[PDB]
Each structure stands twice: as structure tokens, then as C-alpha cells.
């Protein structure tokens, strides 16, 4: 009765009664084939946007292959010439002014095209992040086929809840449909558990596939899956070299995405910014 | 003995013959260092594109740090002045026209540059999605080191196929090379199994690490891993409080990426679109 707790005293629940359970779950293993109509994504039906977006190249083919994972008389002469010179100048200014309006309208269409390609790239990245989570989910379904359907699992709370009996799997659209049979604990005994016990302060023991439960102020052993206290023997314990606990701290890992450097906009632009103030010539 | 099936009747295969297996497996745990030459990715060797891409800033440094995870005299005087005025006008129109051609060429280069930066961003998101899938594969290799190489797994069909014996691991380029030894079932007995049995409708039982197999029209027990029917005793069953099945359904989850609804292009563009029409002055 000189057994002493090793590792502390913890109140935990040990099953005392069970019922047969049937859990039915779907696990996704694939996705529909997804491609992007980049012209329809960015422009819709607007023909000016699509016409300007043609000049952006075949990036949709590249995106979609990523998604699918494959003295007086002379004055009259001067008046005649001035009419032609001013006719050619006025005509030239119109051609200049028409090309300036075209450039400004195309620049504004480019900005909305470019902004909607940033939204497009965010969606392609989201599609790629979902298809990665589907691949993670497809691996979880294959682990349950191997360990729940093609065999019986000793893992508790893996093929549903409780202790595995038998599993069935059926094809379902974009995944697999599992039917699990278990006996699940419906009632628990809140028991006083020590991780190990020290004998006489010299020799420590650990419960072999079970718990050390203090019942009626004496330390007894019970199986972990069912509350049935029983005397501590050599068949249900493991001998520890010492009854001192070896404490360990696993590394602390938190995913924190780092913000990019991205220098000041004006300072970076000033390396090449040609801000000119063009001045028209003075013509008499 | 009035033992009724609980949960239905299912035909499943229980091993009856095994052979020793050797499975050799590669699991990738890392990738080679990948960076992007964005000037070469977008422009290739085209120097007119690489000159214009310099003005796009240091986005490659940002992208690559993400990838690596760190009243006759007067008339002659007028003719002299008119020759200079038309000389200055013609010179100015030429400078304007040269800057109009430059602006149109640069705009067309910016459209192919922007389209190829959208294909660049798709590749970066694909490379970041393979980066997470390799990390997922690196965690699966560390689970096999901990549970197959540094210990013996009680999980069937985990360290290869069948029942684990011993595993070995070697370093392979960008991964770990596993060698699994196990006894895999080569022949099966198709047995009629009930997940549990009910006795007189009062108390149900569940098989403890095994199967309830109906053989010769009497309900028997067998271990799950090997087909050896035996009488149902209290050592190989778990008593259920009731023989009614507790049916549950896990929530249905399908990854269906939401489409990023964008406004009508023309309606959004019309908030700021300046579709001016410029008319040259009338000059007689």
C-alpha cells in the first residue's frame, strides 16, 4: 500500500457500458474538372474588354493547364497655302486627339482588366488550395479503406466512435461513403488515475494497456477500454528503471505568414519616374 | 440459442492464409530549392520586354522569398515668320507622334507582360500547393518512422500491407526510402458476419477484437485477423447494455470553391470611365 502516484493525479473517464453504433460518413476523394473562361471571368459579355483582353496572351491556357494538372498675286498664293497648311495641321491634331482618347480609354480598361486578373489569381490559388485539401481528404479516405474496410482497426475513435467492429465502403459522387459498426461507450466512470506508481520510492511501474485507478484508497489496475479494477500484478504493469518522470516540451510551431518587404512606392518609382511638364511652343 | 443479428448481415473476408511480404516504398519529404527568374519567365530573352519589366518593381524578390520561405517688306517678314512657325509646329507634331507611337507600343507590351504575370502567379500558387502537399507527405513519412521503423505497428495495412513485422528506412534524394516486412493475407474466407448479436432481446454482445461469424447455422466468434471460428465466451465478447443500434451520420462535407462574384464590367468601369471625344480646332 506504499505505492505512490507518479506524474500526478488526474480524473478521467473509463467506459463502463457500451452500445452498438452505426456511423455513416462521406469522405471526398475527387473534384469535378474545373477550368476558367478567363474572358468570361474578367469581361463577361463586354466586347471591348474581350477585344482588349485578347492582347494579354494565352494565359488562360496556362492557368487551365494548372487547374487540370496536365506682291498682291503672291498673297492669294499665300492664302491658298495657308488653307492647306492649316488643313493638314487640323487633320493631324484630330488624328493625335483620336489616338489620345483611345490611349486613355484603353488605359482605364487595362486597369479594370488587371484588377480582375488579381481577383482571378486569388481564385486560382483558392482552387489549388482546395484541391490540395481534397488530396488530403482522399488520403484520409484511403487510410480508412486500408484500416477500417480491408482490416479491423485497434484504433479507438478512428472508424467512427468507439471500438471498431466492421466497416463498409461504397462509391459516392466525388468520394467514398463509409458505414462503420462499433461498440461505443455510452457511460463512463470518472476515475482517479495516476500515470504511474512508485513502489517504496525506488521502483516505478506503468500500466500495461490500462490505467492505475485509486479505488477504495488502494491502487488497482484497470483496462483502459472498460472500467474493471483488478489487483496490480506483474502481468498488467511495466517496470520502470526509475519512478522519476522525464519531462519533454515539443517545439512550439505556429503558422504565421510573413508580410513581404515591398519598399516605399514613391521611392521605388522615383528610380525611373519621368515626370515631365511639356510646354507647347509659343507661335507668334 | 436465440442469438439474433444486430446491425444486419454482411459478407466480409477474413484471412486464412498468409505469406511474408517485402514492400519497398519512397516517401518524399522535401523539394529542391525553386526560385523564379521573372524576367526570363515573362520576357525570355526579348530585351524590349525586359527593359519595360524593370519598371514593374522588385516583385521577383518578393515572390522568390515566398517560394524559399525566408507693305512688301512686311510680307516677306511674314513669310519668314510663317516658315519658322510651321517649322515649330511640324517639329512639335513629330515629337507628339513619336510619343504616341511609344505609348501604344508600351501599352501592348504591358498587356502581354500582365497576362504572363497572371500565368506566373498561377505557377507560384501551384508551386505553393505542391509545397504543402510535400509537407503533408513529409508528415506521413515521419509517422512511418515513428510507428513502423522506431516501433512495431499494430495497425494493419499501414507499414505496407497485412500485419507489420519490421520496417527499415534509408535516405533517398528528397525523401525517405522504406522497406517493410509483414505477413500479408493471400487467401480469405468469405464469412457471414453480424456486427453484434442479441440474446432473447434483452442483452446484446459485440465481438472483442474479432467477428461474429455464422457457421453451420450457429453463431460463433473468430479473431478478425485470422479465420478460426470458436465458441462465443465471455472472454471474446463485450456486453452491450441494449442490442439496439445507435445510428449516427457524420456531417456531409464537399469542397466546392465559391465563385468570386464580380460586378458587371461596364457598370463598374462606368463609375470612372472618361470616354471623351476630342475635336481638333477649326483652322479655316
Amino acid at each position, epitope marked *: 500500500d506504499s505505492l505512490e502516484p507518479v506524474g500526478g493525479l488526474y480524473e478521467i473517464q473509463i467506459p463502463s457500458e457500451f452500445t452498438i453504433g452505426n456511423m455513416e460518413e462521406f469522405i471526398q476523394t475527387s473534384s469535378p474538372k*474545373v477550368t476558367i473562361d478567363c*474572358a*468570361a471571368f474578367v469581361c463577361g459579355d463586354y466586347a471591348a474588354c474581350k477585344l482588349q483582353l485578347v492582347e494579354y496572351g494565352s494565359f488562360c491556357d496556362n492557368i487551365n493547364a494548372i487547374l487540370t494538372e496536365v506682291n498682291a498675286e503672291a498673297l492669294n498664293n499665300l492664302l491658298q497655302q495657308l488653307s492647306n497648311r492649316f488643313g493638314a495641321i487640323s487633320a493631324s491634331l484630330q488624328e493625335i486627339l483620336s489616338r489620345l482618347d483611345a490611349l486613355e480609354a484603353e488605359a482605364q480598361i487595362d486597369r479594370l482588366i488587371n484588377g480582375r486578373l488579381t481577383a482571378l489569381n486569388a481564385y486560382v490559388s483558392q482552387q489549388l488550395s482546395d484541391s490540395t485539401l481534397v488530396k488530403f481528404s482522399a488520403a484520409q479516405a484511403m487510410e480508412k479503406v486500408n484500416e477500417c474496410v480491408k482490416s479491423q482497426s485497434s484504433r479507438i475513435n478512428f472508424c467512427g466512435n468507439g471500438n471498431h467492429i466492421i466497416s463498409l465502403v461504397q462509391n459516392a459522387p466525388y468520394g467514398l461513403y463509409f458505414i462503420h459498426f462499433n461498440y461505443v461507450p455510452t457511460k463512463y466512470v470518472t476515475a482517479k488515475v495516476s500515470p504511474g506508481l512508485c513502489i517504496a520510492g525506488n521502483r516505478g511501474i506503468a500500466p500495461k494497456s490500462g490505467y492505475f485507478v485509486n479505488v477504495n484508497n488502494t491502487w488497482m489496475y484497470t483496462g483502459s477500454g472498460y472500467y474493471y479494477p483488478e489487483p496490480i500484478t506483474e502481468n498488467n504493469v511495466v517496470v520502470m528503471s526509475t519512478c522519476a518522470v522525464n519531462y519533454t516540451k515539443a517545439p512550439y510551431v505556429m503558422l504565421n505568414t510573413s508580410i513581404p518587404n515591398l519598399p516605399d512606392f514613391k521611392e521605388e518609382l522615383d528610380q525611373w519616374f519621368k515626370n515631365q511638364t511639356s510646354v507647347a511652343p509659343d507661335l507668334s | 440459442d436465440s442469438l439474433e443479428p444486430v446491425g444486419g448481415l454482411y459478407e466480409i473476408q477474413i484471412p486464412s492464409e498468409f505469406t511474408i511480404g517485402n514492400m519497398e516504398e519512397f516517401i518524399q519529404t522535401s523539394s529542391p530549392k525553386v526560385t523564379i527568374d521573372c524576367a526570363a519567365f515573362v520576357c525570355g530573352d526579348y530585351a524590349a520586354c525586359k527593359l519595360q519589366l524593370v519598371e514593374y518593381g522588385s516583385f521577383c524578390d518578393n515572390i522568390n522569398a515566398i517560394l524559399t520561405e525566408v507693305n512688301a517688306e512686311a510680307l516677306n517678314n511674314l513669310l519668314q515668320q510663317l516658315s519658322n512657325r510651321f517649322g515649330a509646329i511640324s517639329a512639335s507634331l513629330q515629337e507628339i507622334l513619336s510619343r504616341l507611337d511609344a505609348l501604344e507600343a508600351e501599352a501592348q507590351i504591358d498587356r502581354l507582360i500582365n497576362g504572363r504575370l497572371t500565368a506566373l502567379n498561377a505557377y507560384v500558387s501551384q508551386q505553393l500547393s505542391d509545397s504543402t502537399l510535400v509537407k503533408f507527405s513529409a508528415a506521413q513519412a515521419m509517422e512511418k518512422v515513428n510507428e513502423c521503423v522506431k516501433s512495431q505497428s499494430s495497425r494493419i495495412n499501414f507499414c505496407g500491407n497485412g500485419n507489420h513485422i519490421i520496417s527499415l528506412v534509408q535516405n533517398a534524394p528528397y525523401g525517405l526510402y522504406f522497406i517493410h516486412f509483414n505477413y500479408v493475407p493471400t487467401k480469405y474466407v468469405t464469412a457471414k458476419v453480424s456486427p453484434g448479436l442479441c440474446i432473447a432481446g434483452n442483452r446484446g454482445i459485440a465481438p472483442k477484437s474479432g467477428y461474429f461469424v455464422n457457421v453451420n447455422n450457429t453463431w460463433m466468434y473468430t479473431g478478425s485477423g485470422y479465420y478460426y471460428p470458436e465458441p462465443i465466451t465471455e472472454n471474446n465478447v463485450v456486453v452491450m447494455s441494449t442490442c439496439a443500434v445507435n445510428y449516427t451520420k457524420a456531417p456531409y462535407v464537399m469542397l466546392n470553391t465559391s465563385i468570386p462574384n464580380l460586378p458587371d464590367f461596364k457598370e463598374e468601369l462606368d463609375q470612372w470611365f472618361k470616354n471623351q471625344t476630342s475635336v481638333a480646332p477649326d483652322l479655316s
Partner: antibody
Amino acid sequence: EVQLVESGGGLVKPGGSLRLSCVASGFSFSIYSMNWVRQAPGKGLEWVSYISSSSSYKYYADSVKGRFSVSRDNAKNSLYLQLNGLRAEDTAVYYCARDGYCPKGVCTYYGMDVWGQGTTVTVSA
Amino acid sequence: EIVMTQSPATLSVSPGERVTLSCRASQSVRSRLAWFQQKPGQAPRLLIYDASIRATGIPARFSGSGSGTEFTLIISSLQSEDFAVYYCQQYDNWPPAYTFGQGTKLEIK
């Protein structure tokens, strides 16, 4: 209900031209991708052309590349195929079918569920 | 070019008999495989898509399975109206380059 109707088929001398039309009805044609598939006399199905809902991405089988042109008019819910430079091998029954859903430029694929009844192109001398 | 091969091109079957139609792709098309049925003088009818998903209204007796380069269409309880020509079609990669199998004819027996 939801159906596709082909027209514009008939006898055509070799090297001639035909204009097949596939007017859609019953579904949102403006967002679906469409295909042309031809069936030669007593032979399997051959995919001719694919056109996207925005008409920007058109694809052709190599056997018809250059000589065949696909077009659509989502306002008229109709699909067209220009059969230029018709040869002997182009004698077939030409089908149109839906391919991709594409509700907002994002296409999902569920098979060519809807087909047209076809039209017959006979190219002989 | 992914070539789709169906063998045998002909099958003699009787009503109530299980029929398996095999399809093979020269390259892995993953799960982008569809099954079509073409009764004489009629357009093809989509039966299975994604190699295993029945199209709407398709009877439960038509079952699809497989992935990669081996695909199968199962007609569990063949009926008198199932005597038709059956094709497989692949739509795996981008751009669209769709190739059908040469068909399999179910002859009455």
C-alpha cells in the same frame, strides 16, 4: 425541353463549303461550352471542335484544324460550324453537345449530357 | 493524343446477364472518363461521367468504375433495351482534345 437542333446538312461537292447550325433551347446557352462531334458512316464518334461560352477559346481536332471554324451567338442561342474545304472524310452525321457549365467564367464538367439529333453532311462527286 | 481502346468490339449477351465493357486509355486520364450509349439511328446518350458517376435519369443497372488507364461499365441485369453501341470518352487535360473509344456492340443472343 432541353435540346439541341442541327440544320444545314446536305449534299456538297468535294472542296465545297457548308454552314452547320445548332440552335439551343431549354438551357442557359450563354454559359455552356459546346462541342461538335461527327460520326462517319459506320464508325465511332470523333470530336471536331470545342468553343467556350465567351467564344475566346476555340479548339479543333487536328484532322479538321484550319479547314473548320466554330462560332457561337449567345444572343441567338445558336452554335455554328463552317465546313470549309470539305473532303471525302468529312461525310458524317454532325452532332453538337454541351460540355462545361461555366456560370461566371468558372467551368465545371459533367459529361456531354445533352446532344443534338445531328445533321448529315454528304461529300461525294 | 490519348487513344481509347474498347475490346472486344462485339459481345453476344442475353437479358438478365451481367455485362462488363472494358475501356483502356493509352495514357492515364485519371477520372475523366465518360460512357455513352448509341442506339441505332439516335444520338449518343451519356451514361457515366467521371468514370463512375451516373448521369441523371440513367438506370441504376449501369455502373462505372476505374481510373487511370483501365475503365469498366457494368450492366448488372441487361434488358432488351440495353442492346446498343457503347463508347468511352476521355476529357482529361487542357486544352480540350476529346477522344472516344471505337465502340462496343451488344448483339442479342
